[PDB]
From a paper:
The most abundant protein in human urine, the glycoprotein [name] (UMOD; also Tamm-Horsfall protein, [name]), is conserved throughout Mammalia and produced primarily in the epithelial cells lining the thick ascending limb (TAL) of the Henle loop in the kidney. UMOD filaments encapsulate piliated uropathogens through multivalent binding via their N-glycans to the lectins at the tips of bacterial pili.
The ZPN/ZPC asymmetric unit was then extended by rigid-body fitting within a lower resolution map (4.7 Å), refined in cisTEM, that contained more repeats. From here, we were able to ascertain an unexpected, extended conformation of the ZP monomers in the filament core, wherein a long, 28-residue linker (UMOD residues L429‒F456) between the ZPN and ZPC subdomains of each ZP monomer spanned the ZPC from the previous module (ZPC-1) and the ZPN from the subsequent module (ZPN+1). The linker between ZPN and ZPC of the monomers spans ~103 Å and interacts tightly with the two intervening ZP subdomains. Reminiscent of donor strand complementation in subunit-subunit interactions of pili assembled via the chaperone-usher pathway or the more recently discovered type V pili, formation of the UMOD filament involves a β-sheet complementation mechanism extending across enchained ZP modules. The second unique intermolecular interface (IB) along the elongated UMOD monomer is formed between ZPC-1 and ZPN+1, and is spanned by the linker. IB is further stabilized by hydrophobic interactions between ZPC-1 (F555, F553) ZPN+1 (I413, I414) and the linker (P441, V443). Similar maximum angular changes of ~7 degrees were obtained at both unique interfaces between the ZP subdomains, indicating that both interfaces equally give rise to the flexibility of the filaments.
Residue numbers in the entry:
A (entry chain A), B (entry chain A), C (entry chain A), D (entry chain A): 328 to 584
The structure:
């Protein structure tokens, strides 16, 4: 028939009923007692007109009894409800209880910042990233060629490329900047024929075609095979590469005039 | 206080300290952390007992930072050194870094051998090497005589020689094999008096003496002058020479009996 | 397809091709190498625009090889022909060689003129040329008569002549200048009858006729026989002759008035 | 130093030296040349071992030169003397020449004997030789007596003789054979007194004496004068004479008993 506002703070229990009792149960005048009848109710106004009692959550200050469990401390008492000093039709009692946990967690809000003497040691060094080169037997760059020598007719079409195996593959593209054939295993020699001379292919010779350079970890290009004029019989391939920053630079070169 | 083993490969950085920390710093138990504290150290055994961490040379996989220059990519992180979960006397930190060049050079190891159609043209011919002869005015073979005729008494002593001027002087010695006087400018005539007849001088006549033949580019010999008996008045000198292989033959002849 | 100019001197070999290669083989630009590729060609102009190389005829200065025979020293090398640093359709090579004889003949050009003391001996003497005379039995002067005496009637016709047997027959004609009969074997005697008196016959007597005198080696004439008047019985014939220069004189006399 | 044998025939000149050159000039071996050096010497043996050359007496067959004069044809050449093919101490030359006359005399040796018709005329006659007689006035027969008559006393002594004047005085002596006195001029008369009767005087008469008869051209005798007895007065003398062959006869008579 009635609403029930129960609040429990750390120090005291409060219990109240509203102005619903102005009509409900016919309570023209309202009495409210706890088990110690010296503790009577009053009329609060902070939120609404409320009829209420207040009892400390202690053993016995208004007769309240404390039940003790492993998980909680429980306090209990009873409101007695009446419209008169004496009653004759219905003994109305509101039995109420509330509990508190005994297990809780806490923390300091101040952060502590320590300071300490310190020793600073430095060391340092260097290393390199593996790059390799390969010649292919097949159009689609697919197939390995291991042999320490390959013989070809001059009508044959080499396919070739370079690969970045080492690491940091998202940051560095493999960019060829210079690539050339020599008649010697020493890569420094006075006679060079150029396929890629300055970040661009030597497209003046129509038999050179480039597939991919600077966009990935594996560069690809192709050219018809040839023989050095003069008293020569072997062809060696040498090139120069550069690890190109994929974040702070355009790595794909423009080859034009 | 401590040694430092730093290795950098193409994929990962490794950093280690040895069992020197078994006594040094009192590290009964050893902790080792990088800037991402989820990456902790371990105990390696491939060479010695080493305490070490391993981090890929990438952006951030254990908090490692990459600094970028024009000449190098540099990676850096820090070891934290401790004997306990918590510390109180010295914050020990090892700051380390290593770098990699961005400019590198590469090569193919396979040699390429081309084949090609060929055209073969031959030509050929012949030539000769200049040899000359001279008469001298003086003992030491020194002096020229240009004149188109020389008059001498019969008490006079001619000095004469031949010279190889043409070329290939290290391979061919000038060897006289035959030399004779005629009463005529035609060198073929029926009357001959011999100075050198068959690779040797006609030493039967005591007035002939040879200096050098077959050892050099200039041969030398001498003989008292004479007149052809009969109705004759002029003397002409003619000889035959041979270019002698200094490598595959003894060129100095032996004149004996 | 091409001409070939090969010259070999005593010191160096020269080899060249002309401007035929301006169109031939499409050689827009011309490369020319020997087996040592450091020796390259050049553009000569002394006769025409020629493309050429020059190599000393030695062992190895541009890789040239020397083959040695008994008769010759032979040098050989190869031109490599190309229109580009590198080639792809035809390896064009010109193989060339030239040789030199090892056996040669030489001479001094100065003539030598000796002088010598001399001894001069003279001797000298004299001699004579045989001439003979004959009487003939027959008209055509043909027949010999040996007999130490011949008897004739006075109606008989002697035929007579003289002959030059001795020598120098082209230079000397036999010329009779005087001829006469005596009554004695002494040829000097006071009585003479003349047939030929002074380079001419005594034609006043009609019985004398001359055939040939001064034109040949055998003179001929005839006269009817006769007897000396008086106490005489024998006839002897005597004559005088002269050897006439056939080169510096007319030998045929003119007999007239 | 050397002898020189020079002979010249009608056809050829010969010139030689002997074995004196075996020691002289040291000519161990002997060379001998003329001006045409193709004509060399040889070793003759017909008389001795001689070294010699032979050249026809013509223009140029071994280079010999002919000089022509009015009196002679002269030929000249030179020997060259040597002990070797070539010489050095003395050029030895023998200059020689010989000549032939151009004027010569010749004869036929056959004698010619003519025969001829002949005419024979004879004539003939006779003559006489003058003899005379004389009377003398004086003892020595000396004096003439011309007178046509002489008177004498009878004591007188006539002297008388005869003379042969005519001729042939060497062949004929005048021989008186008969002589007598007559008393008459007719010499035939019957009375004769004889002085010489028969080749002898009538010496019985002591007054007759004969001087010379038959030995010469003049006979002589004498007798005392006398007169014929009887009638007579004149005395005449007559005699008979005979021409006596002085070659085939004794002409002096012997008068005896
Ligand atoms: C130690 O001691 C402590 C302190 O006593 C014990 O902790 C307490 O345990 C109690 C028992 O579980 C909790 O009580 C409540 O029990 C109700 C069940 O019984 C009542 O309801 C039945 C109705 O359900 C029945 O339906 C039919 C019949 O109708 C049956 O056939 C059927 O079988 C059902 O049982 C009645 O029949 C019965 O007679 C009882 O009257 C639960 O319903 C109740 O659940 C409530 O949970 C919360 C409580 O409010 C809090 O949360 C809300 C969240 O929105 C918040 O708004 C509030 O302000 C509160 O903070 C609400 O959702 C409802 O009110 C539910 O009804 C309870 O379970 C005590 O709550 C509990 N005390 C606590 C936790 O502080 C502890 O168990 C002991 N330890 C031991 C024994 O080891
Ligand atoms: C782009 O970015 C790249 C990457 O960072 C740059 O390349 C780096 O340049 C750095 C600067 O030159 C190099 O660092 C090292 O610098 C040292 C100098 O400073 C330190 O040392 C001083 C001591 O010397 C001083 O003495 C007194 C005081 O004591 C002073 O008064 C005096 O003036 C001196 O300065 C300290 O004072 C100072 O505070 C610093 O601590 C150099 O000594 C050092 O040289 C070392 O060189 C090699 C390195 O090891 C390699 O080679 C050996 C060969 O045997 C091999 O064994 C190893 O394994 C390595 O391969 C060793 O011989 C010694 O360790 C030397 O000490 C350096 O020069 C970086 O090394 C360099 N990084 C490279 C090259 O990868 C680049 O310059 C930038 N590009 C620009 C700016 O254009
Ligand atoms: C020691 O070593 C010396 C140096 O090598 C030797 O001397 C050399 O001997 C060589 C061999 O004889 C000479 O070579 C030349 O050989 C040619 C023959 O073979 C080539 O030709 C054949 C064609 O003839 C064939 O026809 C058919 C097929 O087509 C066959 O069925 C047939 O049987 C024929 O063989 C090819 O088949 C063959 O494969 C070869 O290619 C000769 O023809 C050549 O003669 C040339 O002679 C002169 C050379 O030029 C000089 O003279 C001219 C004169 O006008 C002048 O103008 C030049 O400037 C030169 O001065 C030319 O008239 C032509 O060019 C001829 O073709 C040769 O005979 C070498 O020449 C020779 N080297 C000399 C001499 O310096 C020597 O023999 C060795 N001693 C030994 C072994 O004892
Ligand atoms: C036409 O051409 C013909 C042919 O040439 C001419 O005939 C020739 O004339 C020549 C000149 O007369 C004759 O030559 C001989 O000349 C000698 C003289 O000169 C040489 O001798 C001198 C020595 O005498 C000198 O002494 C001192 C110095 O020492 C002086 O001071 C002095 O004044 C003297 O000159 C040298 O000085 C001089 O340099 C010359 O060397 C004559 O001596 C020589 O007489 C020789 O006569 C005969 C020759 O031999 C023949 O006869 C002998 C008889 O027994 C016989 O045995 C031989 O077999 C020969 O048949 C010998 O008795 C001696 O040998 C004498 O020395 C000559 O007179 C040529 O003989 C002569 N040729 C003939 C004749 O065939 C002709 O004259 C021309 N017609 C003209 C010009 O009209
Ligand atoms: C590569 O080849 C060269 C010769 O072609 C070798 O020699 C070097 O050549 C360069 C110029 O081409 C010179 O600057 C050096 O001084 C030379 N070095 C020597 C040691 O001579 C060179 O050594 C070769 N490289 C190798 C074999 O790795
Ligand atoms: C050299 O002289 C000779 C004559 O002495 C010249 O004639 C040749 O002689 C040889 C034998 O000596 C013969 O086999 C040849 O047939 C001759 N040739 C002629 C053309 O007659 C020879 O010509 C001279 N050489 C020269 C002038 O160079
Ligand atoms: C030739 O006959 C004459 C006589 O008729 C010989 O005598 C010579 O005669 C010439 C004159 O006729 C004189 O000048 C000489 O003096 C004479 N010589 C002598 C020696 O008397 C002459 O000898 C005869 N010739 C001969 C025989 O050969
Ligand atoms: C000489 O005298 C006589 C006479 O005495 C002459 O007469 C001759 O005499 C001889 C005899 O005596 C006779 O035989 C002759 O016959 C006589 N001749 C004549 C002619 O009578 C004689 O004639 C006288 N002579 C003279 C004169 O001369």
């Amino acid at each position: 028939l009635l609403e029930h506002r129960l609040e429990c703070g750390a120090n005291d229990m409060k219990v109240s009923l509203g102005k619903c009792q102005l009509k409900s149960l016919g309570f023209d005048k309202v009495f409210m007692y706890l088990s110690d009848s010296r503790c009577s109710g009053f009329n609060d106004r902070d939120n609404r007109d409320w009829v209420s009692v207040v009892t400390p959550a202690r053993d016995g200050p208004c007769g309240t009894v404390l039940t003790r469990n492993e998980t909680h401390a429980t306090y209990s008492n009873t409101l007695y409800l009446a419209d008169e000093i004496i009653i004759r039709d219905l003994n109305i009692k509101i039995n109420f209880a509330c509990s508190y946990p005994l297990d809780m967690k806490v923390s300091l809000k101040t952060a502590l910042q320590p300071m300490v003497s310190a020793l600073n040691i430095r060391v340092g060094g260097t290393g390199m990233f593996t790059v390799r080169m390969a010649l292919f037997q097949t159009p689609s760059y697919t197939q390995p060629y291991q042999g320490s020598s390959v013989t070809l007719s001059t009508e044959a079409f080499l396919y070739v490329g370079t690969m970045l195996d080492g690491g940091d593959l998202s940051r560095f593209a493999l960019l060829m900047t210079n690539c050339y054939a020599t008649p010697s295993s020493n890569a420094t020699d006075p006679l060079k024929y150029f396929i890629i001379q300055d970040r661009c292919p030597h497209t003046r010779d129509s038999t050179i075609q480039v597939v991919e350079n600077g966009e990935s970890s594996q560069g690809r290009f192709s050219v018809q095979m040839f023989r050095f004029a003069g008293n020569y019989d072997l062809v060696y391939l040498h090139c120069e590469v550069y690890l190109c920053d994929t974040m702070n630079e355009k790595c794909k070169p423009t080859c034009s005039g």
